[PDB]
Amino acid sequence: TMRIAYAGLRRKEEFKALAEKLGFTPLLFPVQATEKVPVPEYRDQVRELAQGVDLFLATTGVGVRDLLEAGKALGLDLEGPLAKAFRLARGAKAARALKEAGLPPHAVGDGTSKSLLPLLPQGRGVAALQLYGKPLPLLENALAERGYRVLPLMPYRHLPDPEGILRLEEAVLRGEVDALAFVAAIQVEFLFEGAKDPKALREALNTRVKALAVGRVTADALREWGVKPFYVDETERLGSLLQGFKRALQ
Numbered sequence: 001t002m003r004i005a006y007a008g009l010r011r012k013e014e015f016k017a018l019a020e021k022l023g024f025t026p027l028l029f030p031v032q033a034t035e036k037v038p039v040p041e042y043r044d045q046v047r048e049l050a051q052g053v054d055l056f057l058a059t060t061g062v063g064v065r066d067l068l069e070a071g072k073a074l075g076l077d078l079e080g081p082l083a084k085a086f087r088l089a090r091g092a093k094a095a096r097a098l099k100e101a102g103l104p105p106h107a108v109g110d111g112t113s114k115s116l117l118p119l120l121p122q123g124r125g126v127a128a129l130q131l132y133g134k135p136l137p138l139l140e141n142a143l144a145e146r147g148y149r150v151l152p153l154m155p156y157r158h159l160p161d162p163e164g165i166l167r168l169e170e171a172v173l174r175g176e177v178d179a180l181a182f183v184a185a186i187q188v189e190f191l192f193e194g195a196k197d198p199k200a201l202r203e204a205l206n207t208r209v210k211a212l213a214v215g216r217v218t219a220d221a222l223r224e225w226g227v228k229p230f231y232v233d234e235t236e237r238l239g240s241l242l243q244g245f246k247r248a249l250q
């Protein structure tokens with residue numbers, strides 16, 4: 001044998017080593033670019049945050065930490081404004097980061113943007129939305145619906161690897177791969193947004209090539225593109241997906 005393509009970037013050497021040990025032929029087809037691009041307005045947005053906001057929404061633990069570090073690098077007091085804000089955490093990791101900063105959240109979702117919808121207050125003012133490398137339109141528009149002016153805090157843009165996506169699509173369509181492992185929802189997005197033939201690609205991943213998802217969020221992204229995942233690891237570990245996929249196959 002099974003040729004398994006990995007759409008990931010970070011753990012590609014770990015994936016290769018473990019796949020080989022489990023009797024697979026690993027293939028590395030990252031769909032994200034190594035380069036992040038800074039968001040020019042970000043420093044200005046953190047300075048605005050420092051002026052006080054009504055809501056603060058945290059999406060990731062790493063994102064929370066990085067925002068707090070950015071406030072320090074800029075010589076600002078963020079903990080004061082954040083202490084006064086009504087704070088939401090999208091999931092436990094965002095929540096844990098807030099708690100560790102002395103800023104425990106007032107509401108926590110289940111790790112999905114959608115789980116925050118019922119938790120959002122109606123009101124007026126500024127809602128600061130912590131992001132890292134990707135916009136969250138469902139949540140951003142939901143905030144505007146609720147009456148709030150949205151202040152994005154996205155330091156970077158995650159970028160696709162356009163030629164790499166095209167190569168991966170060809171490999172899938174030409175039968176060079178038996179399975180394709182996705183470890184983040186953004187990899188699914190990049191691939192289907194970058195595909196020359198997204199209808200053919202969907203068909204292949206439904207009929208010929210097994211789409212493997214590490215995590216429910218990744219699996220939901222496949223489903224939104226009309227792809228039924230062959231295997232979903234809800235342990236959310238790459239190692240576990242590979243062992244679990246081996247059994248599912250037989």
Ligand SMILES: O=C(O)CCC1=C(CC(=O)O)c2cc3[nH]c(cc4nc(cc5[nH]c(cc1n2)c(CC(=O)O)c5CCC(=O)O)C(CCC(=O)O)=C4CC(=O)O)c(CC(=O)O)c3CCC(=O)O
Pocket residue numbers: 008009010011059060061062063093094131132133134158183184185186187217218
């Ligand atoms: O390699 C991995 O880390 C697993 C795959 C993964 C990727 C892709 C890859 O790395 O190959 C990935 C891409 C992202 N990195 C993101 C930010 C980070 N998460 C990071 C750690 C995580 N990667 C977590 C899972 C992932 N997030 C997850 C699981 C999750 O997304 O819930 C986390 C923990 C997230 C958290 O702290 O709340 C890290 C640290 C990585 C490092 O320093 O080695 C960063 C910053 C960085 O890219 O360096 C974000 C979030 C965003 O932009 O809002 C995303 C989008 C996630 C998605 O679409 O599902």
